UniProtKB/Swiss-Prot annotation, chain A:
Quaternary structure, from the entry: Homodimer. Each subunit binds overlapping and non-identical half-sites that flank the central CG base-pair in the pseudo-palindromic motif 5'-ATGA[CG]TCAT-3'. Interacts with the mediator tail; the interaction with GAL11/MED15 is direct. Interacts with the SAGA histone acetyltransferase complex. Interacts with the SWI/SNF chromatin remodeling complex.
Name assigned to this protein: General control transcription factor GCN4
Parent-record interval covered: 249 to 281 of 281
Family: Belongs to the bZIP family. GCN4 subfamily.
Domain of life according to the entry: Eukaryota
Organism placement in taxonomy: Eukaryota, Fungi, Dikarya, Ascomycota, Saccharomycotina
Source species: Saccharomyces cerevisiae (strain ATCC 204508 / S288c) (Baker's yeast)
Biological role stated in the UniProt entry: Master transcriptional regulator that mediates the response to amino acid starvation. Binds variations of the DNA sequence 5'-ATGA[CG]TCAT-3' in canonical nucleosome-depleted 5'-positioned promoters, and also within coding sequences and 3' non-coding regions. During nutrient starvation (low or poor amino acid, carbon or purine sources), it activates genes required for amino acid biosynthesis and transport, autophagy, cofactor biosynthesis and transport, mitochondrial transport, and additional downstream transcription factors.
Record text about domains: Residues 89 to 100 and 106 to 125 define the N-terminal activation domain (NTAD) and the central acidic activation domain (CAAD) respectively, which can function independently to promote high-level transcription of the target genes.
Swiss-Prot record, chain C:
Domain notes: Residues 89 to 100 and 106 to 125 define the N-terminal activation domain (NTAD) and the central acidic activation domain (CAAD) respectively, which can function independently to promote high-level transcription of the target genes.
Function: Master transcriptional regulator that mediates the response to amino acid starvation. Binds variations of the DNA sequence 5'-ATGA[CG]TCAT-3' in canonical nucleosome-depleted 5'-positioned promoters, and also within coding sequences and 3' non-coding regions. During nutrient starvation (low or poor amino acid, carbon or purine sources), it activates genes required for amino acid biosynthesis and transport, autophagy, cofactor biosynthesis and transport, mitochondrial transport, and additional downstream transcription factors.
Location relative to the cell: Nucleus
Name of this chain's protein: General control transcription factor GCN4
Effect of deleting the gene: Abolishes recruitment of the mediator complex to the upstream activating sequence (UAS) of amino-acid starvation responsive genes. Decreases RNA level of genes involved in amino acid biosynthesis and cofactor biosynthesis during amino acid starvation or methyl methanesulfonate stress. Growth dependent on amino acid supplementation. Sensitive to amino acid starvation. Sensitive to purine starvation. Decreases cellular glycogen levels during glucose starvation.
Subunit structure: Homodimer. Each subunit binds overlapping and non-identical half-sites that flank the central CG base-pair in the pseudo-palindromic motif 5'-ATGA[CG]TCAT-3'. Interacts with the mediator tail; the interaction with GAL11/MED15 is direct. Interacts with the SAGA histone acetyltransferase complex. Interacts with the SWI/SNF chromatin remodeling complex.
TM helices/strands, residue ranges: none
Taxonomic placement: Eukaryota, Fungi, Dikarya, Ascomycota, Saccharomycotina
Family, per entry: Belongs to the bZIP family. GCN4 subfamily.
Annotated segments matching region Leucine-zipper: 4-25
């Protein structure tokens, strides 16, 4: 139950990191227009 | 419950990340990059 | 458990800020 939480939080930490990089790419692209 | 509150927050984050990623993917389709 | 709460607060903060950045892009692209 705790292990289930830990795994999901780890997934979320990773997913947030990678999603932010995609947002930063968009910001770069849109900002150079 | 302190544990229940944590599980709720995690479920919230999982939902939020799903939906936010879809919004980012949409932007990526629109930007074409 | 406390370390997990800290990570979750981190995620909640990061999601909030990231969403606002996504919202700004939606206005611009939109």
């Amino acid at each position: 139950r705790m292990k289930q939480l830990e795994d999901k939080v780890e997934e979320l930490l990773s997913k947030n990191y990678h999603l932010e990089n995609r947002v930063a790419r968009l910001e770069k692209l849109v900002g150079e227009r």
